[PDB]
Design a protein around this ligand. Sequence first.
Ligand SMILES: C[S@@+](CC[C@H](N)C(=O)[O-])C[C@H]1O[C@@H](n2cnc3c(N)ncnc32)[C@H](O)[C@@H]1O
Ligand code: SF4
Ligand SMILES: [K+]
Length: 245
Amino acid sequence: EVIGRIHSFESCGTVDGPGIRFITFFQGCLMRCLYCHNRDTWDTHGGKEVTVKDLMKEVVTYRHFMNASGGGVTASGGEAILQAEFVRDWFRECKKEGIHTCLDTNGFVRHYDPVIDELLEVTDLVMLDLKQMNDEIHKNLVGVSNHRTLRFAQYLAEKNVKVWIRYVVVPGWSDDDDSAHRLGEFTRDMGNVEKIELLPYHELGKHKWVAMGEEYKLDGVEPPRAETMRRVKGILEQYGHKVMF
Ligand SMILES: C[S@@+](CC[C@H](N)C(=O)[O-])C[C@H]1O[C@@H](n2cnc3c(N)ncnc32)[C@H](O)[C@@H]1O
Ligand code: SF4
Ligand SMILES: [K+]
């Protein structure tokens, strides 16, 4: 059986509407976001080993809180798509149970092997992070280029995969007008994008960096003002998508 490495899993009420989301936080990430609120998910060799069978035993205990009206499973992390074969197998079993599936990903897809298409076939919703359209800023904010993520966004559009875009708004890094316009331009013709969700930066998880003995590089940065969230939202709305925060 395929072995997955997970940081943890948790059942949580959906953000809105009834029912619950069973979220598995997969272990391992290859990005280095200065704001990462889950620094302990980076190590690919850490976490706990689990089988799909093990995980489904936990999932089915919440069956009655997952329905068409609300609820399901989410693969998050960490970067779940680094373990695409396991997530595919997991989602395949969730589909046999009639459970809604959501993939929460940074889109850092480096190999387009058949497993990716197979995963998407059993993925109902992709929540895709677009962290910065300006690659010069992206490299300084995340440690890697945004090229792979942008290619994956376009791949999802070509396959008409349902997508929510998520954009973390960080003062001094991703709150400027130009970056917002770039995001609106890039996603405008993606008819598969149901909405753009703006997430205000928060300093949760700083202690996880201190535990590793590493400097948190965004000390002193505060959450964005409501005025800033409204400005970014208004810019994005000019490009025709539903924008929310
Ligand atoms: C831990 S990552 C899990 C999924 C995947 N690793 C990713 O980033 O796309 C849940 C969401 O919160 C965002 N996030 C991470 N740190 C944050 C912070 N300090 N403030 C606000 N959002 C943050 C992530 O960008 C992602 O959109
Ligand atoms: S992609 Fe997600 S888990 Fe990975 S470093 Fe960035 S915020 Fe953290
Ligand atoms: K995401």
